[PDB]
Amino acid sequence: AMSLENVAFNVVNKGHFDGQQGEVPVSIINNTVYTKVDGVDVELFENKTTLPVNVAFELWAKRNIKPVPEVKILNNLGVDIAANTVIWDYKRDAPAHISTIGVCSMTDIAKKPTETICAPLTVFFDGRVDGQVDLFRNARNGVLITEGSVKGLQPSVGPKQASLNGVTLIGEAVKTQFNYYKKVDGVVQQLPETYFTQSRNLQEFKPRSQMEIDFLELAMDEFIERYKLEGYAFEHIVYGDFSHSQLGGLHLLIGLAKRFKESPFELEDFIPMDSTVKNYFITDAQTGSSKCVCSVIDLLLDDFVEIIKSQDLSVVSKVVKVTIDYTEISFMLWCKDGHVETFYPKLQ
Amino acid sequence: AMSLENVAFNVVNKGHFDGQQGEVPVSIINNTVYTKVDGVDVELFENKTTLPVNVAFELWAKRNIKPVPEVKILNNLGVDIAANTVIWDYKRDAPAHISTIGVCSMTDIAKKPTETICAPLTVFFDGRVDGQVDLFRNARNGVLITEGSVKGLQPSVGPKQASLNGVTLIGEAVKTQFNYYKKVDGVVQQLPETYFTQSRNLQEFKPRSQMEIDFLELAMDEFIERYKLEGYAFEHIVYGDFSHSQLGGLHLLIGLAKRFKESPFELEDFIPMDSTVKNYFITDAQTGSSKCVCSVIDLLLDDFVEIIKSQDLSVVSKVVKVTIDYTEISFMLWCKDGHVETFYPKLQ
Amino acid sequence: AMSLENVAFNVVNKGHFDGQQGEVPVSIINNTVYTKVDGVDVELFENKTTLPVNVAFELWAKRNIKPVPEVKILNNLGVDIAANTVIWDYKRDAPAHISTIGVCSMTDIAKKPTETICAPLTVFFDGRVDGQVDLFRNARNGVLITEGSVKGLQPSVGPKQASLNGVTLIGEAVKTQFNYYKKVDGVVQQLPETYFTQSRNLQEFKPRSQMEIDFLELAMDEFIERYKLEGYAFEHIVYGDFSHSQLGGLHLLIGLAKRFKESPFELEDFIPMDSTVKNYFITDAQTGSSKCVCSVIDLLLDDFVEIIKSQDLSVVSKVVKVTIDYTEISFMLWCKDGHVETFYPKLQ
Amino acid sequence: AMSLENVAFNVVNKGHFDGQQGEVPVSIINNTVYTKVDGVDVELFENKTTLPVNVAFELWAKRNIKPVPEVKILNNLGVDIAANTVIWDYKRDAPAHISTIGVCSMTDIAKKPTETICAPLTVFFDGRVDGQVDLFRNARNGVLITEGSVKGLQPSVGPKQASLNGVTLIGEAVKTQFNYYKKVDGVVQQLPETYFTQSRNLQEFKPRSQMEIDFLELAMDEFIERYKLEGYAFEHIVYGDFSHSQLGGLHLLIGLAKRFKESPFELEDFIPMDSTVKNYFITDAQTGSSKCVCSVIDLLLDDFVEIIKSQDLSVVSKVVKVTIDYTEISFMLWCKDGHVETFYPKLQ
Amino acid sequence: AMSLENVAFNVVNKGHFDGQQGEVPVSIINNTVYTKVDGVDVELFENKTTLPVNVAFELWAKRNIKPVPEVKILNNLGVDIAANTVIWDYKRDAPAHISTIGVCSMTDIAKKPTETICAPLTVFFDGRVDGQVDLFRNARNGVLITEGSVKGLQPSVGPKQASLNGVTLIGEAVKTQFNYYKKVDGVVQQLPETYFTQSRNLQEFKPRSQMEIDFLELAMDEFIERYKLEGYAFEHIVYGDFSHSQLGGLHLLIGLAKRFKESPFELEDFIPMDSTVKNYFITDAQTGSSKCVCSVIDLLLDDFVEIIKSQDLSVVSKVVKVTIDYTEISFMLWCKDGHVETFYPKLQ
C-alpha cells in the first residue's frame, strides 16, 4: 500500500522511509510537502529536483542510508540505475539516476533487475544486500560493490571514503572501502589502475600524508626544497599566482586550503554536481585576482607529485591522460627548456 | 487508509470517491493532479481553490453526488459546514465550506458533528442519510433537509429545484424538493414565507407559466396591456432601456432572455459566486448601452408581478423588503404620481 | 543550432517549426511562452504538459502536421515512440509519447531509430517519409503506416479517418486511410480483423448509413420494428433508461446524440484521454437520472447491430470479446429467456 | 491612498475602479486575486499578463470603460502609452501598453503627460476628457481622438466602430466614430487616406451592404457574374480552393463566413493579438485541406472589389500597397494573360 | 545568434557568457534553469529577480566580470543604465538597472548609447572599454570611470574599493580606484567633495587606520582618552548602549564589529539593497536590547571623528548634512550643554 501520506508518516516517525504502516495529514504547496502537527503545517521536504514534488519526496524518503559510493564514482563507471534502492545525489538535491527498479511506481521501469528492460542498463548492485551478488552474476551489465572477496572474481579496490547521508567520510564504525566489479555485455571487465580523488572540503581540509602535513605547515620555498620539486612549477600549479589579473594555476585543492586559512576567496560552483574534476569561477578577495574557469581536483599531494614526476618534460604542450576515479582525466602539460610551466585538468 | 493514491484510484475507476480499495500512481505539478495511464500523464484535477492541490482533489472527489440544495440557499440559511459530506460549489470550482466534519484529515475540525467544536457552527444535515435527523435534533445549530415528514418538526417547503453534480434541475427520476428546518442556539426557528429564484440560464432560458410564455412571445405593448401592467414601468425594469449611454433597468432574467434572442450582450460576472441577487457589468452589443453594476434576479414573472403590484405607489422612494430564497432582499421603489418609475434590487 | 528563440521564430513566421533560420525575443513565465511584438508580450504557448515549459513548446512546434493515426489507434497497437516526429495528443494538449527520436535534445533517447536503445521499443514509422519503410523492416519492434502496397508485407486496412492538426476527418484533399503493419521481436505480426470506432462528437454528430439516419429520425418503437431488434434491449442499451435514479444503459454515442437534440446532459470526462471505450460521469438535465461510470463507444450502428445479433442469447451472463480499433474490448452480456437484458462495455 | 484592498473594494462594489473609499480583505495565490465573501474565497481576477498579479489587477480595474479605439488602430498609429487611463487589450487579457501615466504607482513613468519623460513617446489623448485636447497641443508626440471639431486641426475620420469593454460595436446610444489626430516631433501629421477593417467574427458575421448580402446568398458563379468579377480569381482569393492538400487562397473573412455555414474548420490563432491582417493555421474539417500561414483580413467586400479592380493586371508579380487601418498593407498580386491568379496579404 | 541554449553553453563551458558558439540542452522549471549532464538535470541559475527566468538568466550570464563601482555609488550618481554591459547587483541577486543597451533583446532599449532614447538617461561608461571615453564625450547625460587621466577633464577620485564578481575589495592585482566624471545636459559637472563608505563586513572587519586598530584593541575608556573624545558621546554613538530595552546608538560599523567579537547579535536587513546608509532591526543576544530601525554606516573612524568634531555643539537638535558616496546624507545631531548626546544618520 504505497501512498503519499504513508511516506510522510515514515519520514515523521522514522526519519526516512522504513516500510512502516500509518498515515499523517499532508498538504502540497508549490514544490513543498507539509504535514500538520497540532494544527500548524510543518515543512517536510522542498523539491529541488525536476521531478513532480510528490515523486521526488518519495524517492528522497527511500534514499540509501548506508555508506554508498560517491556519485562521481558511479557516473565514471557508467551506472545507469540502482537495484532496489535510491542513490540520492546530495550535491544536486536530486536522485542520482532518472529511473528506479522496485522503488517507486512513478519512476520504476521494473520491479526486479532481472526484467529485460534492465538488461542493457548498467545496474548498480550492493553486495551488502542479500542475493545482490548473485543478481550481479546473472546481470548483463552492472557494477557491484562488496566489503569482502567474491569467489571467482578479481576485485578492484575502491576509494577509502564513501557517502553516508551526504557526508563523505572514511568509515571507522562502518566500512566505506568497497571492492568494485563491472560487467559489460555479460563479460567481467578488468577495471584499470586508477588514482582516487580524496573528496575533501575547502573549509575543513585534513592532510592524509606527511607530505600534505608538510605542505600545509611549511612555507612555499621550504616545501619545494624538502621534496626536490624545483622545475615542476608548484608555485603556479599548486600554490597559485595572484600577481596578475588572471589567477595563475591553483588547480589542487590543498593549495586552495592553505590559502583559505590566511585570506578567503569566492568560488562560484557554476555546474554544481559531483565530478572528479570541479570547475569554479574564482575571485581572490585579498588581491582581486580571478579566473572564470578554474579546474580543481583533490588528489593526494603524493599522488599529484608522482603524476607530474612521471611525465616527459620535453615538448611545449601535450595532453596527459590519467585514470582517476575509474575515468580518463585529460591534463594539459606545458613545458619550456625541460621544466614545467603549467599543468591543469584540461578545459575541453 | 486514506491516501492521495487511493483517492485517485477511486476517481479513475468509480468516477469519484467510493470507498474502494486500490492505488494508482500520481504526480502533482503545480496545481494539477496527474495519473499515469499507459506511459503518459493524464490530468485528473486542476485546483481552482485556495486549498492545497491534493487537499482540494480529495474534497472534490468526496463531493456529494446526490441532489443537494443550491449554494445560495445554504448561504442564505447561514450554513457554515456540512455533516460528513462535501457540498461542492460548481460555480466557484471549490468547496462550499472551508472546513469539514469526518471527510478529510487536512480540513476536518471534527469526526462527528456531536463534537463540541461543531456546536456554535450551523451544521448542514441530510435527512436522507441514516441518523442525521437525530443529529439535527441534538445539534445546537444546524440546517436539515428531508424528503418527508419529521414528527413534531414544522417544515418549510424548499425550492422545486436542486443541484445534481453541478446541474440545477427539478427532479423526475429523483426528488429535489426538500423540507427545510433550521436551529439557532438549540431552538428550532420558524423559517419565513419566501419566494424562490428559478436558477435558469440566459443561454437556455425556458418559461414556466402562461405569463412567461406571453412575455417571450408578445411585443412589449400587448403584453403590458394583457396583464394590466400600465404604470408599473416594465418598459424600464424588465424590458430594459437601451437608448442612453447608461443601460436603464433590466433586472429580471426573463427580460435579458428576450433581448438575447434578438441581439447578444456581454455580462461581466465580476463576483462569480452563487447568490440570490446577481450583479453584472453589462454591455449591449447592438447599441453600446452599458451599466457597471446591473443587478439581475430570476424570479418567476408571475411572482415579480405579484410583488410589484403589492406595493404602495404613493411615496417618492422607499426600501421594499422581500423574502427570496429565505433571505431578505431589499429593493428600491421609485414612484411618481401614482406610477412606478423604477424598481430594482438595492445595491449595498 | 536548435534554440528556444529559433523555435519561437518558426512559430511566429511559419505557424509551426519549419526548419527556418531566425530568432525572436522570448520571455518565459510560469508555464507560458511569450514573445515581444511591438512593445508588448503576446502568448505563444501555454504548457499543459508535465514536461518543462520550453521543452513542451518545442515538441508542440515540431508536431506532425500531416494526417496521422488517432492516439487511441497508436495506443492500442502498443506504440511507445515515434521515429523523427512528434505525434501531438490534442485531447491531452501533450505529446502522445514520453520520449522522442531525433526531435528535441531534451527528450531524445536517440538520433535515429536504428540505435540499439530503440530496439525494444515499438517505434511508429511513417511510410510517407523517405526511408522509413526500410527502417521498419530493420526495426525489432514497430508500427508502420503506408498509403499503398509494401512488397511482401501483408497489410491491414486502417480506419477511414485520421487526425489532422487535432481535427479528426475522412480525407478528401488528403488521404487518411492507411495500411497498418506491426512487428514484435523482429517478427511481423498478423493484425486481427477489427471494427473501428467512428470518432464523432456529441455536438456535431452525423449519421453515416441508412440505419443511422433511421435511428435519429424514427421513434424508438418503429426503428426497433423496422430493423427486427425485438428482444435485443436497445431500449436499455442504446436509447437509455432515464426513469430510475441510476441511468440505465446508454452506451452508444448515437443514442446520446438522439437524446441531446431533445434535452441536454452533463458529461464529466474524468479520464480525459483518447481511448476506444470512453467513460463519463453522466447527469441527465431533464430527469436527474445519473450514473458515475457510463461507458460510451462510437460504433457505426450497423456494426453494433451486427455484433449484438452475433451473440448466443442462452446464458445468463458471459464476457463477450470484440476486436475494436485493433484492441480486444470485453463486453458483458446479460440475457433472460432468450432475450437480451443488458449489453455494455465491461468496466475493469 | 491607493491599495490592493481598495482596488478590490471598488471591483466588488462598483464593477471596476471608481475612486471610492473602502477596503475588502484580499488573498493572493499564484496569479489569482481572491476576496472573502461570507467565509469562502471568491475569484476576482486571474492574471494572464507578464506583470505581477496585483499590478495587473489594478490596471485591469482602472481600464477605460468608455468606447475606445481598437488596439490595432492605436498600434498602427504608433501609440506607446495612454494619458491617465488604461487601454485594456481584451484579445490579450493584458494592458495594451507597458507603462502608464498617472494610473498606477508600479507602472507609472509620470504623473502627467507634460513630464519630459513623455515627450519622445506617442501619448494617446482622449478629447472627451477635460484638458486633454490642450495636452495634445503641448505634447511632442501623440495621438488624439475627439467627438467633434478641434479648431485649426485638420481631422481624420476614424472607423465607425470602437471597443466598449471588449465588445466591438458601432455605437447607437454612444458615439464610437472619432476624429483622429497625430503629432510627430511637435509637428501635426497628415493622416493618410485609408480603408478600415470591419472587425467582425466568424461565428456572428453579418453583411453590411447589398454586395455582401449577395455574396452570402448567391452561389459562386452567379455572384461573380452579377458583379462582373470574371478574371479576378475570387474562386481562389475569396471563396477558397479546398481541392489540394494546401488550402488555396481564402483571405477574406466573408469567404470564411460563407464556408463556415456549410462545414466547420479549425483556426489556430498562433499569434493571438489584435492586428489589421490576421494569420491562422487553418484546417478544413470537410476535406482536410490546410495551410500553415493563411492571412485573413475583414474588408467590406465592396472595398475589396474596389481595391482589386484598381490594379494593373499586366505584370506577372508585384507588391501592391494599400492603406488599411492607417497602416500600409503590402499585398502580392500574381497575374497571367490579363487575369488575376492570386492576390493575398504578403507574408513578411 | 542569441539564444537560451547558447547562453547556457557559455555558462557551462566558460563560467559566464563569452560570445562562444555552441548549445546545450536546457529545461526551465518555475524560476530555475537546468541543463542536462549525462542524463541528469543540473541547476544553472535560480531567478531571484522580477524579470522572466530566461531573461534574468541571460543578463546574469552577461554580467560585468571586471571590477566595477559598487551599486550604491552608481545609484548616488544617478546612473540609469549601463553602456553595453550588465552591472549585476549581488545584494539583490538582480540587474542593477531596469533596461540594457546592446546586451539582451528582451531588455535592450537600444543597441548603442548614441541612439536618441539614451540621450536623457544617465549612461554609465567604462573607460577601460575601447571608445567609451569618446562615447562619454558625446553623451548628453552620463557617468564615466577611468583608471588614468582624461585630457580636458578634471577627475574626481573615487573610493579605493570596487566590486569584483560580488566581492568588494581594494585591488592589488587589479585597479579598483577609478576617476569619476559626470555630465548633465551636456555639461561636465564638478563632483563635490565627498567621504566614502568603506564597504566592510561585520564578520571579517579589518581596520584601515591606526585609530581603527586602537578602537578594536583598546577598551572604551582608554580609546576615548587617547584620542580626546570626551563629550562626543562615542559611548552611545559608536560603542552602543545595551542597558535599556531600546539599544542606544550603535550607528558605526566598527562599533558593531568590536561587539560582535565578544557576543553576537541579530541584524535583520529588512531592505536588502546596496545603500550608503543601511538600516537593520537589531537584537542583542547577550542582553536582549533591541532597536527596530538602527541606521548603520561604515565610515573610516578617522573620517567619522573629523565629521563630528567639525560641528557646532550649541543647539539642542539640528540636521547635519554630509556628502558621502557622492550623495547628501542627513544626520541628526543632538546636543546638551555643549556636549554631544547622539548623532545618527537621520531616519526620514
Ligand SMILES: COC(=O)c1ccc(S(N)(=O)=O)cc1
Ligand atoms: C575548491 O574545490 C573543492 O573544494 C573540491 C573538492 C573536491 C574535489 S574532488 N574530490 O572531486 O577532486 C575537487 C574540488
Ligand SMILES: COC(=O)c1ccc(S(N)(=O)=O)cc1
Ligand atoms: C444574467 O444573470 C443571470 O444569468 C442570472 C441567473 C440566475 C439568477 S438567480 N437563480 O439568482 O435568480 C440571477 C441571474
Ligand SMILES: COC(=O)c1ccc(S(N)(=O)=O)cc1
Ligand atoms: C459521450 O461520449 C463521446 O462523446 C464519445 C465519442 C467518441 C467515442 S470513440 N471514437 O472512442 O468511439 C466514444 C465516446
Ligand SMILES: COC(=O)c1ccc(S(N)(=O)=O)cc1
Ligand atoms: C478568421 O479570421 C478572422 O476571424 C478575422 C477577423 C477580423 C479581422 S480584421 N478586423 O483585422 O480585419 C481579420 C480576421
Ligand SMILES: COC(=O)c1ccc(S(N)(=O)=O)cc1
Ligand atoms: C552592520 O551593517 C553592516 O555590515 C554595514 C556594512 C557596510 C555599510 S556601508 N559601506 O554602506 O556604509 C554599512 C553597514
